[PDB]
Design an enzyme around this catalytic site. Structure first.
Site, PDB file in Angstrom:
ATOM      1  N   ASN B 186       0.498  -1.018   0.005  1.00 21.13           N
ATOM      2  CA  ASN B 186       0.250   0.321  -0.025  1.00 21.13           C
ATOM      3  C   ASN B 186       1.451   1.567  -0.322  1.00 21.13           C
ATOM      4  O   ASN B 186      -0.132   3.050   0.606  1.00 21.13           O
ATOM      5  CB  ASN B 186      -0.816  -0.184   1.180  1.00 21.13           C
ATOM      6  CG  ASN B 186      -2.020  -1.172   1.117  1.00 21.13           C
ATOM      7  OD1 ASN B 186      -2.179  -1.769   2.141  1.00 21.13           O
ATOM      8  ND2 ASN B 186      -2.412  -1.641   0.293  1.00 21.13           N
ATOM      9  N   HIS B 188       3.053   2.508   2.194  1.00 21.64           N
ATOM     10  CA  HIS B 188       3.784   3.016   3.498  1.00 21.64           C
ATOM     11  C   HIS B 188       4.893   1.676   3.791  1.00 21.64           C
ATOM     12  O   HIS B 188       5.648   0.420   3.317  1.00 21.64           O
ATOM     13  CB  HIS B 188       2.172   2.576   4.906  1.00 21.64           C
ATOM     14  CG  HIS B 188       0.711   2.990   4.468  1.00 21.64           C
ATOM     15  ND1 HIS B 188       1.528   3.904   5.153  1.00 21.64           N
ATOM     16  CD2 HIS B 188       0.325   2.531   3.321  1.00 21.64           C
ATOM     17  CE1 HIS B 188      -0.315   4.474   4.984  1.00 21.64           C
ATOM     18  NE2 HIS B 188      -1.037   3.546   3.737  1.00 21.64           N
ATOM     19  N   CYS B 223       6.590   7.277   9.078  1.00 21.90           N
ATOM     20  CA  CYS B 223       7.386   7.894   8.632  1.00 21.90           C
ATOM     21  C   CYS B 223       6.821   8.108   6.947  1.00 21.90           C
ATOM     22  O   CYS B 223       6.655   6.706   6.869  1.00 21.90           O
ATOM     23  CB  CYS B 223       8.912   7.263   8.713  1.00 21.90           C
ATOM     24  SG  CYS B 223      10.292   7.813   7.316  1.00 21.90           S
TER      25      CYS B 223
END
Ligand SMILES: CC(=O)NCCc1ccc(S(N)(=O)=O)cc1
Ligand SMILES: CC(=O)NCCc1ccc(S(N)(=O)=O)cc1
Lengths: 265, 264
Positions: B186, B188, B223
């Site tokens: 995804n 991330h 992050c």
């Protein structure tokens, strides 16, 4: 995994893991390259090693990668089973080659193929050399004697000469550095890290709209644990092609050069 | 892998790969953490998420990691088979927990244990909230009803409060940035990347003479793909360290944690 009936090749099946896939929910090219290394290692273990021949260990000689060429037709999806077959061949005094064929376990169809050229190096001085008569004899016992090529075509992409990218590069990613996870069990940077670093300078828009079909890498110098690298890319071209260069961030010493071919989704 | 007889836990076996091991020829802690995520994912798929419940998808709710605690007694060697059992538990309206037990497949001996706390977040606003009755009811169908803890001891290391490292740090590794291989499907940053970045500021001499026994991470902020991080470490002592990950520019905290290392 297991050696085949004739004992001249090795096959292993892998279930693609959740953390191994990209945005398309299929295995990344770095996951594929890591699976190629793993099946290569299991093959070397199955044919008696811990593939540095007996005479090589006595002479402090090791095999190092000179070139890696991978072509993927379909990346396996998360949860899919992929079967990889690998074998080695002696290339006279030049070096050795390791080849791989990737298949969809359910259909039996070829989904990818890869080939790598390896040259002999003294582990201490780092000086390259030709393969001696004695090393060739020891290596030939677990290789097919007749040529068996993953890329047989008499004008194929795996044997093309790669030019050096000239400044200014069209795209760049600077200040790349390896962390402990990028190292292998002997504290050397894993070869797959260089594929990741080459790809870092491809724009995200190409990655979102295209699939990587072919990557050829020419290894010139090893990146140390404390080195810092810049990744440079320039478009050379429904297909997009790029020229790549990895060099040390400070003095600009070349570490790798390569090319990639991408097809529109 | 498979669900157990009662359908309340999941087990899977993994052969440790050549590229997964460190200088000791045993699996790194990041390899272990990736195997924990993989068995967790296979468990979620086996119980019908082929674990965001039906009412969570309708409400645009997702689970995010608040804390991860791992204790390893023996890292499996290259070629060894490790069996991992995982299960999840509702913790009232606070959130949920996923626990894991790692065993040597040949001896049946427990070689490691892990536990993780998860909190509910709105995927769009990124605002946290309590679980609610409907979500707890849907989550309880695949969890044991009685408590089952990987860390049962009444005052164990997984529940300790972690302080914020104060400048100056004893050790640091600056300018860490994620590459595409650090991202999940995804886009991330994968949680395991933060473990790797925490460990980057431990001196190589400690890594060469000690084995990591315990790591506890407290997740505060995610992050982004284009963020740059500094990893800070100070010795608090076996050797023990306090850790802090923060954004390279403004110093916004992203994670804090502690590690305990045993002399080889
Ligand atoms: C003189 C000379 O070229 N020595 C070889 C050094 C050498 C170059 C490249 C690599 S690799 N495959 O890790 O990129 C290893 C060693
Ligand atoms: C308000 C608030 O804290 N929202 C949660 C944001 C959030 C914090 C951390 C992480 S993780 N597990 O990737 O480190 C994800 C989301």
């Amino acid at each position: 995994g297991s050696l085949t009936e004739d004992g001249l090749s090795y096959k292993e099946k892998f279930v693609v893991r959740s953390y191994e896939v990209g945005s398309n929910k299929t295995a990344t090219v770095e996951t594929i390259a890591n699976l190629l290394q793993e099946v290569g290692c299991n093959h070397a273990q199955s044919v008696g090693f811990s593939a540095t021949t007996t005479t090589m260990r006595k002479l402090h000689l090791i095999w190092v990668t000179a070139r890696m060429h991978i072509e993927i037709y379909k990346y396996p999806a998360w949860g899919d089973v992929v079967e990889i077959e690998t074998w080695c061949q002696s290339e006279g005094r030049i070096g050795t080659r390791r080849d791989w064929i990737l298949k969809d376990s359910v259909t039996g169809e070829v989904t990818g193929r890869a080939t790598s050229k390896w040259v002999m190096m003294n582990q201490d001085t780092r000086r390259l050399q030709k393969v001696s008569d004695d090393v060739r004899d020891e290596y030939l016992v677990f290789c097919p004697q007749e040529p068996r090529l993953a890329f047989p075509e008499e004008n194929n992409r795996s044997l093309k000469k790669i030019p050096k990218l000239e400044d200014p590069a069209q795209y760049s990613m600077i200040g790349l550095k390896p962390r402990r996870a990028d190292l292998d069990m002997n504290q050397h940077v894993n070869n797959v890290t260089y594929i990741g670093w080459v790809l870092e300078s491809i724009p995200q828009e190409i990655v979102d709209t295209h699939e990587l079909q072919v990557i050829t890498l020419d290894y010139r110098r090893e990146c140390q644990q404390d080195d810092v690298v810049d990744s440079l890319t320039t478009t050379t071209s429904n297909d997009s092609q790029f020229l790549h260069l990895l060099r040390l961030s400070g003095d600009g010493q070349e570490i790798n050069r390569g090319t990639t071919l991408w097809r529109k989704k």
